Amino acid sequence: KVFERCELARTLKRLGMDGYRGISLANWMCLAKWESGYNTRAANYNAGDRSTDYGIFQINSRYWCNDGKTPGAVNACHLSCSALLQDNIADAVACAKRVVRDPQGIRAWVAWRNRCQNRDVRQYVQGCGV
């Protein structure tokens, strides 16, 4: 599923992401925007280390979900990576919350540092009623 901007913003707020571990909704929106373009079925293989990024938040198989083919991997979210490819983003959100519970927080995703950190992220939620 490819979410429309405001539709996703309202969905994320209802799922309790606004201010989770100090992360504003606009930051989560910026992250999903640059990671997948608000697309839940995106799965990108990383030829370099044999891991794959899954779903709307592009969560990595080496540490967060199990896909069985990633060497020396753990499954901190206790989910099959297939769960992160559903149109219903409840599981992806639960796992995203888990990721940020670690010391790095939102910085765990390099795309956030490149495209969201220290920028005006207001545009991602403007006019969405959240």
Size of the site for Na ion (CB under 5 A): 4
Question: Distance between terminal CA atoms of the chain?
Answer: 21
* Nearer Cβ to Na ion (40/70): 70
According to CB under 5 A, which residues from 23 to 62 bind Na ion? 61
Rounded Cα distance between 83 and 60, Å, is 13
Q: Smallest distance, Å, CB 54 to Na ion?
A: 10
According to CB under 5 A, which residues from 67 to 106 bind Na ion? 73, 75
* Nearer Cβ to Na ion (45/126): 45
Residue nearest to Na ion (CB): 73
Catalytic residues: 35, 53
Q: Smallest distance, Å, CB 69 to Na ion?
A: 9
Rounded Cα distance between 117 and 68, Å, is 33
Q: Which residues of 20-41 are buried (b: 16+ CB within 10 A; e: fewer)?
A: beebbbbbbbbbbbbbbebebe
Tokens of 74: 């753990």
Residue 66 engages Na ion in binding (rule: CB under 5 A): yes
Q: Per CB under 5 A, which region of 49-57, 63-71, 108-116, 117-125 contacts Na ion?
A: 63-71
Rounded Cα distance between 124 and 104, Å, is 23
The binding site for Na ion (CB under 5 A) comprises 61, 66, 73, 75
